[PDB]
Structures are given as structure tokens and as C-alpha cells.
């Protein structure tokens, strides 16, 4: 008996404005979806599209009109044709190409609502066994090795269980060697941001000595055949992030043996059902995965942490505590470490009771709603 | 220099309702991009995004905000760069937008209006500017499917009587072999293509293989956009070329297609690919790979249709275009003079140094549901 869909557009000041090409990003623009049934029971979710289409093609502005004028009307029409199963929600959105982050916002709000409605932990409905998740810190490159080392020192001293070092041609082996020299037992992964070419196979192979968890995006996006050849020659798992947009590119990856680890963003995949399907494909291929982040508000952070509880999510998540992102977030209690470098998996039956509604009112720049029966 | 950009959101009544997906609709929404320089020289283009995101992920609503709030500001910033100081080279305009992912139909509208402005500024035919040699192009007709084989054959005769040099039949499992067999027997020498719109699955391969007996020019989009290896295996099993349209959105996807042997024919739509420069890069790669290409349609207004016929002049565009005369689609279009056959089934390639002079300003104005203008030097616009 879902009755209302309310879209909230928010701007939250970032604690640590991020550098871009021509300036800086100081606010997180996010869209929260709030679903309300006839009895007042709610489910919420966050569309993770970023303000500018620099990381994927969706951005807050285009997500907003996609929800308002296309996906919400479709969802309402589908509702008006017979209790609701959150596993079937994407059937309403059958005919829509891409727009997976806008689609995810609807689909995840419906799961969140259904957890609230049934009073069952959302993580339990999805099949998440893990009770706590380890968290990684990402470290930028530095021309100075001493500066890189200090950044690792500071991370380890803040509790972190994994570090992920950015690397690139001429700025890889020296750094990783010096880090592994200093911390023989630390989990270290590397992120190459597509800076290597197939000729660099021997350099990457050289890194096998350091027992990296994975090397993320070694080659340009869509160098699929080159990637499959490169992974065949490396003992270290290749990890893909933006190269795998959908369950399809995942099947391509599996068939070619092009990578062994996935950076999963449930919103980018199109929601919880899509994440579960991806983990099925991945598990059958003998791959493993971890949850990456999109500097989410606490609503999306909660859902990401729940996804990180899923069995195949064997590596550390990039989702840190709220206070690494925002001075003030949208939850009554911020997400925080429960042990150094470790976060408790959210056991809420839906996030709604955890939302600070005064904080959502204050950060809102626009609101739009519709009666789903109309 | 270029001083103003005006975006026009249009709604054009159609002669009769066009087929949606599961519906029909009365009116074609379109976005035109208009650029004006300090001397009053103009370029136009059409953003080909459809009203619903059912063919690709872009639609009218999202393309409008992408243009207003993201791409036009980026383009203004680039126009003020020292390197655009004396000449604006349309070849390089995509560098203003190099940090945007996807959004290729919105990107293409910028890029193509700049090409168009540049031809008008230099008084050179846009087609020669892009290396398009053909002087004329042949035109195909798309025929819907009916559970009546009579309706079908009647539709085919009607297309043929009108001179169309190809027919493309809509097909689906259970309504494929019978229609094609009948048309092929009746028309032994007619170019026939088929468009499956993703209606087949890998288990249907035996049915599609039965189709090789009819010598189709291609079968378009046989499978969903679900798995590249299913496609590769199907094409390897078929003597008939597979044609991809929406499955190929970029030159890199075309590289992968060719590497997989997943298809042999490309439906080119410059807007879907990211503009004229992207289209030339796609044709390079398709020709190197042994693929044939042709230009498809998006129910374009006159602006988009003119630009699409100019791309269809390019050397590798070896098959007929789906871009037919204005009047098949609209009582009143945005050109002073409708696009028409020069001979039955044939259209003269536009020789305009830009389409600006051909635009009916009154029609553009009547069909406008929204209009946004911006001073390109400052960045103040209004509604």
C-alpha cells in the first residue's frame, strides 16, 4: 500500500573539499528518496550520482529529472497492478536504458521500506552474514617518499586495516617497496587509475613480490583483450572499478579472465538485486569483491555497509566513518568505528528511524513528491 | 567570436502517432542548438535524444539539463581560452568536454553546431569539409510487423511503388521466416534488411540461421544488450551480417565489436556517436575491420536530418539511409523547404555551408516549449 514518493535534494558541506581540474568541490549534492506507505511506514535511499558527470555519465541534475519525469511515474504504474516484492521492483523499469544510479535509488528504497515494514534487519533479508567490516584508507601519490611514508604512518595510526596506494609509471615499485619494507604485515592494494599499457606487464609483474591485495584499473578502460593477457601473466589479482558498469561487462570480464576482483558500488549496478546478481556471476567465476564509495551521506553509507556484509565481499570497504566526510551528516548518530579500522554492519530494519529529519530539512534545496495512486 | 548560444526545446506534431515501445505518441520533442557570433553568423544542430530513455540512456529532459547546466558552461570556458583566440577549429571542440563521461548525444549537439557554424563562417559546403563525396544517397523504408501477411505485402508494394531502394522488416520470434520468405519470393532483387529490436535470445539461433536462405543485407540488434560473447557466437554461426545500432555507442565499443567478430554492419547516427569527428573515427575503424556502414534515423527534425544526410555522403556509407523525406513524418518541419526525394528513393546530399539559411524561424518559434539563451562571454542566461 505504498502511497507517497518524496524526493529530497540536499547540499551538505564537505569537511575536506576535493580538488578538481579547474577548482574545487565543496558540497555533496545528493538526492534522497523517501517512500511512505498507507500506515506511515517509510523506506529511504540515496541516489549516488555525483554533481558533475566526471566519474559516470549520471549527475544530480539529470538524475533529478530522470526520477521525477520518468522513473517515479513508471514505478507508480507498476504499483497499480496488484503486497510488493522488493526483488521484482526493477520490472517496473524494464524498458529504461542505463540510468542505473536513478534506478538503484528507487529499488533500494523499496528494500529499505520492506525491512521497516516487516521489522527484519535489512542485512539479514539480503543474506549478509558478516557482523563487522574492515575499512581501507586511500593515499595519493607523492613525489617525496618520506611524505608518502608519513601518510601511511598516519593511516596506520588512525586504525586502518588496509591502505590503497595510488601508483603510476615511474612512481610504483619504489613506493610499494618502501611501504612493504616498513610494514611487512599490512594489507596493501594499489590503484593505477588506467596509467599503464600492455608493455608494462614486466613492471606490474615485478610488484608480485610485495603481495598486494590487488592492482585496480592497470590499463585504459575497455582494453579488454589486453587486460585478459595482462592478468594471465600476473599472480596479483587485477581489480576493476569503472570498467564494469553492469552485470554484462562482468560476464565479459569472467569469460576472458580479465580480472579477479571487483570494486562494487551497488548504486552504479542498479541496486541491491543487481548487486546480488553480480556477486552470483563473480562467485561462479571464482572472483571476489569489496564495496567502494561515492562520498555518500549517511543513508547511502548505511546501505553500502550493508552490502559490504555480503559473503563475497572479502576485501576491506572504502566506506569510512561519517566524520571523515562531513561535520554534520543526516543520521541521528554518525557512522563511526566500532574497533580501530572496523565498522559495525548496520542491523537496522530499514534506515528510516536513524534519519535526523531536522538535518534533512536544513540541508534541503528542493523537495518534490507525488501520490503513487494518482 | 561566438557570443551567444540559444537552446530551443521543440514539440512538433506528427502526421499520425509514431510507435513508442508498448505505446504511441502524437508529438516529437526535439532540442535545437543555435550558436551566433559577433558578426551574426550562425550554426544550428539537433540533439537527437528521444523523449523516453528506451533506445539509449539519454532523453530530452536529461539532455536539456546536461546542456544548460554542464556542457554549455564548459564550452563557454573553452571559447575564452587563448588557443581559441583567432580560429575556432571544430576538430578540437570535444576537448572542451573531455572530462564528461557518456552523454554523447548532448556532446554531439555542441560539436555539430560548431561544425555547422564553421562552414557558414567560411562559406564552405559542410559536406566537403568532412570529406563526403557521394552527391546522392539511396533511402530505405521500415515496415512494421503484422500478424496479417497481407498487410505486410501491401506495405512492401507501397514502399516499392514509391521508389525506396531497401525495405527493413521488423521481425520477432514466430513472425520472421514467413514474412521474409514471402517478400524475398515477390521481390527477388530488392535489398531487404531485418530489424529484430532485441527480441531474440541465444536459444533462438536455429531460427535466425534459417534466415540465411534469404540473403538479407543484415539482421539488426538480434539480441539484448546482455552479453558480448552470446553475440560473437551468434554472428559466427550466421552467414547474414549482424548490424548493431544502440549496442555501439563509442569508437571503443566498435573496436571491441570488431575484435569479437560480433557484427559486420554499423548503423551510424552521428548524434549517438558523439558528433561528426566521432563518426569519422568510427568509419576509419569499421573500414579497417571490413565492416559496412549506413546512416540510421531518429525521427529527426530538418536540422538533424540535413546533418545525417551529410554524414551519409561519407565514403564507407555503402548502404541506403533510413533518413527519408520530411513529409513522411511532419505536416510542418523547421526548414523553409522540406527535405524531399530528388528522384524516387533518392535524396540529394545537402551542399549548404551550414544549415542556418534553411531554418524556418517562424516554425522554430511556434514549436518552442522552452527557450534558453546565454551570453557566452559572461555566462548570464535567461528563460
Per DSSP, the residues of B277-339 read: HHHHHHHHHHHHTT-EEEE------HHHHHHHHHHTTSTTB-S-BS---GGGT-SS-SBSS--
Specify whether B170 is catalytic.
yes
Q: How many CA atoms lie within 13 A of B257 on its CB side?
A: 28
Contacts of A65 in chain B (CB under 8 A): 61-62, 65
Taking the CA atoms of A76, A82, A85 and A88 in sequence, report the sign of the dihedral they define.
negative
Cell numbers 544488450 label which residue? Answer: B225
CB contact under 8 A, B61 and A55: no
DSSP 8-class letter at A195: -
DSSP 8-class letter at B358: G
Q: How were these coordinates obtained? A: X-ray
Element (H, E) at B180: helix B177-186
Q: Are B21 and B7 in contact (CB under 8 A)?
A: no
CB contact under 8 A, B53 and A252: no
3-class secondary-structure state, position B366: helix
Catalytic residue among B170, B181, B233, B255: B170
Cell numbers 521474409 label which residue? Answer: B180
Q: Are A111 and A88 in contact (CB under 8 A)?
A: no
Backbone angles phi, psi at A141, to 5 degrees: -75, 155
The C-alpha torsion from A312 through A315 and A321 to A324, rounded to 10°, is: -140
Closest Cβ opposite residue A65 in set B65, B99, B226: B65
Grid cell locating A343: 565498522
Closest C-alpha to B102, from A248, A56, A49, A265: A56
Task: Chain B: give the shortest CA distance to residue A66, in Å.
Answer: 7
Specify whether B269 is catalytic.
yes
Helix axis angle, B251-260 to A224-232, nearest 10°: 60
Taking the CA atoms of B117, B61, B293 and B275 in sequence, report the sign of the dihedral they define.
positive
Q: Are A237 and A189 in contact (CB under 8 A)?
A: no
Across the strands, what pairs with A240?
A262
Whole-number Å distance between alpha carbons of A373 and A2:
8
Q: What is the 3-state secondary structure (H, E, C) of B242-286?
A: EEECCCCCCHHHHHHHHHHCCCCEEEECHHHHCCHHHHHHHHHHH
Whole-number Å distance between alpha carbons of A372 and A81:
12
Closest C-alpha to A299, from A41, A8, A3, A5: A8
The beta strands (E) that lie in chain A are given as 2-20, 23-37, 42-47, 132-134, 136-139, 162-166, 187-191, 215-216, 238-240, 261-264, 288-291, 342-344, 364-371
Element (H, E) at A334: none
Q: Are B28 and B12 in contact (CB under 8 A)?
A: yes
Whole-number Å distance between alpha carbons of B154 and A364:
59
Contacts of B252 in chain A (CB under 8 A): 221-222
CB contact under 8 A, B227 and A251: yes
**Residues of chain A in Cβ contact (below 8 Å) with chain B:** 21-22, 52-57, 59, 61-62, 64-66, 69-70, 95-99, 221-222, 224-225, 248, 251-252, 255
Closest Cβ opposite residue B100 in set A53, A61, A255: A53
Whole-number Å distance between alpha carbons of B311 and A182:
60
3-class secondary-structure state, position B46: strand
Q: Are A211 and A181 in contact (CB under 8 A)?
A: no
Burial of A109 (0-12, 13-18, 19+ CB in 10 A): buried
Contacts of A61 in chain B (CB under 8 A): 65-66, 69-70
- C-alpha distance from residue A332 to each of A55, A294, A360 (Å): 30, 21, 11
CB contact under 8 A, B54 and A248: no
Whole-number Å distance between alpha carbons of B106 and B74:
12
DSSP 8-class letter at B211: G
Q: Active-site positions of A?
A: 166, 265
Q: Are B313 and B349 in contact (CB under 8 A)?
A: yes
3-class secondary-structure state, position A98: coil
Closest Cβ opposite residue B228 in set A22, A98, A252: A252
DSSP 8-class letter at B212: G
Whole-number Å distance between alpha carbons of A296 and A331:
12
Q: Which long-range contacts (CB under 8 A, 24 or more apart) does A337-342 make?
A: A337/A135, A337/A159, A338/A132, A339/A132, A339/A159, A340/A158, A340/A159, A341/A134, A341/A135, A341/A158, A341/A159, A341/A160, A341/A161, A342/A132, A342/A133, A342/A134, A342/A135, A342/A159, A342/A161
Backbone angles phi, psi at A232, to 5 degrees: -60, -30
Domains contained in chain B, CATH given: 1-123+355-383 (3.30.390.10), 124-354 (3.20.20.120)
Angular region, A133: left φ>0, alpha ψ -120 to 50, beta rest: beta
Whole-number Å distance between alpha carbons of A154 and A17:
20
Q: Per-residue DSSP letters for A148-191? A: HHHHHHHHHHTT-SEEEEE-BTTBSHHHHHHHHHH-TTSEEEEE
Nearest CA in chain A to B106: A57
3-class secondary-structure state, position B9: strand
Cell numbers 565489436 label which residue? Answer: B257
> What residues contact A265, with CB distance under 8 A and at least 6 apart?
A48, A291, A292, A293, A294, A304
Enter the resolution in angstroms.
1.9
Query: Exposed e or buried b for every residue in B284-294, given b needs 16+ CB within 10 A?
Result: ebbeebebbbb
Task: Chain A: give the shortest CA distance to residue B54, in Å.
Answer: 5
Closest C-alpha to A261, from A234, A241, A235: A241
Closest C-alpha to B101, from A49, A52, A66, A18: A52
- C-alpha distance from residue A363 to each of A105, A327, B88 (Å): 19, 13, 42
Amino acid at each position: 500500500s505504498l502511497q507517497t514518493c518524496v524526493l529530497h535534494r540536499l547540499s551538505l558541506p564537505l569537511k575536506f573539499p576535493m580538488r578538481t581540474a579547474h577548482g574545487h568541490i565543496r558540497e555533496k549534492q545528493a538526492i534522497l528518496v523517501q517512500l511512505v506507505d498507507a500506515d506511515g511506514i517509510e523506506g529511504w535511499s540515496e541516489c549516488v550520482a555525483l554533481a558533475e558527470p566526471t566519474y559516470t555519465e549520471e549527475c544530480t541534475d539529470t538524475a533529478w529529472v530522470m526520477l521525477v519525469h520518468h522513473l517515479v511515474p513508471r514505478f507508480a504504474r507498476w504499483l497499480r497492478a496488484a503486497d510488493v516484492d522488493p526483488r521484482t521492483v526493477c520490472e517496473a523499469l524494464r524498458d529504461v536504458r542505463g540510468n542505473r544510479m536513478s534506478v538503484a535509488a528507487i529499488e533500494m528504497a523499496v528494500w529499505d521500506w520492506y525491512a521497516a515494514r516487516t521489522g527484519q534487519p535489512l542485512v539479514g533479508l539480503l543474506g549478509g552474514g558478516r557482523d563487522r567490516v574492515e575499512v581501507s584508507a586511500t593515499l595519493g601519490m607523492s613525489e617525496s617518499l618520506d611524505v608518502l611514508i608519513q601518510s601511511v604512518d598516519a593511516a596506520v595510526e588512525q586504525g586502518f586495516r588496509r591502505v590503497k596506494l595510488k601508483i603510476a609509471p615511474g612512481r610504483d615499485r619504489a613506493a610499494i617497496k618502501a611501504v612493504r619494507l616498513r610494514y611487512p604485515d599490512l594489507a596493501i592494494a594499489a590503484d593505477a587509475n588506467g596509467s599503464y599499457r600492455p608493455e608494462d606487464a614486466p613492471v606490474l609483474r615485478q610488484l608480485d613480490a610485495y603481495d598486494l591485495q590487488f592492482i585496480e584499473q592497470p590499463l585504459p578502460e575497455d582494453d579488454w583483450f589486453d587486460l585478459a593477457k595482462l592478468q594471465a601473466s600476473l599472480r596479483t589479482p587485477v581489480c576493476l572499478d569503472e570498467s564494469v558498469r553492469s552485470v554484462r561487462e562482468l560476464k565479459l570480464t569472467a569469460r576472458l579472465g580479465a580480472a579477479r576482483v571487483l570494486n562494487v558500488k551497488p548504486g552504479r549496478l542498479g541496486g541491491f538485486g543487481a548487486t546480488l546478481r553480480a556477486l552470483d556471476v563473480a562467485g561462479e567465476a571464482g572472483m571476489a569483491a569489496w564495496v567502494g564509495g561515492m562520498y555518500e551521506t549517511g543513508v547511502g553509507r548505511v546501505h553500502g555497509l550493508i552490502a559490504a556484509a555480503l559473503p563475497l565481499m572479502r576485501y576491506a570497504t572504502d566506506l569510512g566513518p561519517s566524520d571523515r566526510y562531513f561535520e554534520q551528516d543526516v543520521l541521528k548518530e554518525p557512522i563511526a568505528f566500532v574497533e580501530p579500522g572496523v565498522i559495525q554492519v548496520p542491523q537496522c530494519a530499514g534506515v528510516a528511524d536513524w534519519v535526523d529529519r531536522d538535518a534533512v530539512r536544513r540541508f534541503s534545496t528542493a523537495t518534490w513528491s507525488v501520490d503513487l495512486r494518482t
